[PDB]
């Protein structure tokens, strides 16, 4: 059980990936405008 639930609640943290999606489109905006 110890090596089981830790991976699951690690993969819970993937909203930071969607924040990176937001910021990647933002960097796309600023870089293309520049």
């Amino acid at each position: 059980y110890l090596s089981k639930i830790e991976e699951l609640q690690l993969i819970v943290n993937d909203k930071s990936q969607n924040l990176r999606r937001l910021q990647a489109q933002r960097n796309e905006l600023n870089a293309k405008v520049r």
Partner: protein, 152 residues
């Protein structure tokens, strides 16, 4: 509503009190938040007989709170009645608390055990190798070598 019953001096209301604590805890789960110190008196006293099961019900109720450091202290201090109970799914929580504290403790003792060691309770390191007996005798050696690398 059994809090005022935890004031009587004789143990033969206190054993019945814990005997009904673990009975109606399933309704009164968040009750002992207002009875912390009344469990502390029934635990810490060296003239009381059934002091360890106060730490057992305290383990249960501070698990219901989510006080994993308080339940870590109780994972130590609950005694042999703690260690005898491992066929459950509270056992993953006790190894969560103790083994996580233990592997960051082994990162601490991966810095300087050559002097100024932290004295380690025999249940703290006791359930380490004693839960590791499950990997010693239960046919699995990748989990065994995983813990043996986590213990540093």
């Amino acid at each position: 509503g059994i809090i005022s019953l935890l004031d009587e001096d004789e143990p033969q209301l206190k054993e019945f009190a814990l005997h009904k604590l673990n009975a109606v805890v399933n309704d009164f789960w968040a009750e002992i938040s207002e009875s912390v110190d009344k469990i502390e008196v029934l635990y810490e006293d060296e003239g009381f007989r059934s002091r360890q099961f106060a730490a057992l019900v305290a383990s249960k109720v501070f698990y219901h709170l989510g006080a994993f450091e308080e339940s870590l202290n109780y994972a130590l201090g609950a005694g042999d009645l703690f260690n005898v109970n491992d066929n459950s799914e509270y056992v993953e929580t006790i190894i969560a608390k103790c083994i996580d504290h233990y592997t960051k403790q082994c990162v601490e003792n991966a810095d300087l055990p050559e002097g100024e060691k932290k004295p380690i309770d025999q249940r703290l390191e006791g359930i380490v190798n004693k839960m590791f007996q499950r990997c010693l005798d239960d046919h699995k050696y990748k989990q065994a070598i995983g813990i043996a690398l986590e213990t540093r």
